[model samples]
Target: EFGEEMVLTDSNGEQPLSAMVSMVTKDNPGVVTCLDEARHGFETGDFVSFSEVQGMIQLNGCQPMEIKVLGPYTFSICDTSNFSDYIRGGIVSQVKVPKKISFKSLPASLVE
Candidate 1:
């Protein structure tokens, strides 16, 4: 048995999850390729916000954008047509939006 003093906190308060962007394409819906070593752990429906994007500065500190995960090292975001071309380094961070969760009471479960 592993016994250690641990503290628990709300999962919603967790720090922002992020990944480094090694390259980005000039495609309509810009495709962001992350570093191989980084292995961006993103899902299709997840939302990501950008920062420190060099050429595509429009994404930097902009509103959170929903992403479509293409692979372990690639994901696509919104249209980049209006935005400047992707030139260099950037960071993609996961954004956690609040959701409503409902649970049944212990007494209700006993009836099942």
Candidate 2:
């Protein structure tokens, strides 16, 4: 049983990247529309998670479900490759921070 404690510090530190499903539409194949009131400020390769989401129960099982931001208020399942087959609503949080951290660990051999 071992793991590292990570603190993501930055403007969004102590926070997570997230947004609400203002709307979801896809008349076009492989595209999920994310309509928010303001700018999302996400990049092409940036990773994000979703929560408190409704309509898209299919994704609920994918806790900490990472998605790729396709564009402003727009994203697709990390490996789905196609947003064209979706119907949903909800929120998203995009928090990247804690800049640094301190993780402690001890070798089991030291005791064994």
Candidate 3:
């Protein structure tokens, strides 16, 4: 009785993140492209502009092993000595914000 209920859907390709997107957006959601001139933006092969500067405070503001900033892209992932392994990996990096900031942005989600 405590577990999350199963979410049934028609499509086999459905996933949790997709479900969240669909819930927030109606059917068609427009994609956002990063500003070409903005050096500190995530460079998806097709680009997605989260902001003009890297402002993502990172989930729970935990300390990441490595922090990568490419052009405008900032990544918070495991700090690996071997760059060749994770250079093109579709992974991101992270950091920990203080409790004050966490409560400011997402109070309900933050832990004291």
Candidate 4:
């Protein structure tokens, strides 16, 4: 096995994930189509986050989640999962790159 060491990724790091929910009539839980006819260069297994997304509670949060791209502008949600709710005018963004990531002991909180 290769020895472990700090490495930098060729990835442009984290870039803004931008997209909008379309009104072209959508899928059950498999894939999603955009309203616009723009080619969004999204690949499978990229981490993305959603905001200003209406109707879908599973996607609107401060947490970053992985995504699967199925087509030029089509993709699946959480792999094999269905869309519980529909969305419109949603704002999608790529998860920002972290300046630094580490784990440490938590400082004591005031609350018990």
Candidate 5:
């Protein structure tokens, strides 16, 4: 029930970028530190999804959170006060939001 051509063209999501969590501070805006070797290549305002979190299980499989890159190995997420304290392993992955695109019909393009 789907258009094959449209499906092919719509598969434009970026390759997933992810990092291993080394530390997470329980602060107003939780700061997530990645493993030394895992230099998280995230920019400010990027959305990140979490998984495999030990203590702060709430973050695991939660909705993607907007992030603010602090350094090569760190970023900030929403307040974690209500969430359980972070204790061990976790993963931070980039979530690529899909962009809407409009295509011109073949007939309309023929004149141009």
Candidate 6:
């Protein structure tokens, strides 16, 4: 129905993923479906969206402490704060949007 896209998110300066992911585009959509944990470090099986993935892997941080899946689709994304969340689906599948959305937009560097 829609196209695949990723964006930066926001948080209350409290953790990261818990704040969830906010799309960094004119759309500014969120994520859904997939699960997030500190185990595989953003497991979509294809790629992980973390700006400080290197820093998180190097230091005591995990970069993505929260997540947001696009439900039923492979293009959805997950954002976090401290630890990376594990996705429960395959990224090679079709891209999809959240089952529902609220049009909440944020800054680009918020997730970075």
Q: Highest lDDT among the candidates is held by which one?
A: 5
Using TM-score as the measure, the top candidate is: 5
- Global lDDT scores for all candidate models: 0.71, 0.47, 0.23, 0.53, 0.74, 0.28
The candidate with the higher lDDT, 2 or 5, is 5
Question: What lDDT tens digits, residue by residue, belong to model 6 across residues 9-79?
Answer: 33224232221222221122324332233222233322333432222231123221233334422223333
Instruction: Give the CA lDDT, 0 to 100, for residue 112 in model 4.
Output: 62
Candidate 1, residues 25-95, lDDT tens digits: the string is 87767677898776555667777777888998888846777888888898888876555788889888776
- Relative to the unseen true structure, what is the C-alpha lDDT of residue 85 in candidate 1, on a scale of 0 to 100? 83
Clashes of each: 0, 20, 12, 4, 0, 20
TM-score for each candidate, following the candidate numbering: 0.72, 0.48, 0.21, 0.55, 0.74, 0.17
lDDT of 5 at 67: 87
Which 10 consecutive residues of model 3 have the lowest summed lDDT? 17-26
lDDT of 4 by residue, 40-62 (tens): 44456666666666666456643
Q: Which stretches of candidate 4 lie over 4 Å from their true place?
A: 1-15, 23-30, 37-39, 79-83, 96-112
Candidate 1 global CA lDDT score: 0.71
**Which is the better candidate, 2 or 4, if ranked by lDDT?**
4
Candidate 6 minimal-lDDT segment of 10 residues: 18-27
Candidate 4 or 3, higher lDDT: 4
Candidate ordering by TM-score (highest first): 5, 1, 4, 2, 3, 6
- C-alpha root-mean-square deviation, each candidate: 10.4, 12.2, 16.0, 14.9, 9.5, 15.8
lDDT of 3 by residue, 46-79 (tens): 2121111122222113232322333242222232
The sequence of per-residue lDDT tens digits that candidate 2 reaches over residues 7-99 is: 223443234545556654433322355666625444454445555555554344344444466677676555433232345565655533233
* lDDT for 92 (candidate 1): 81
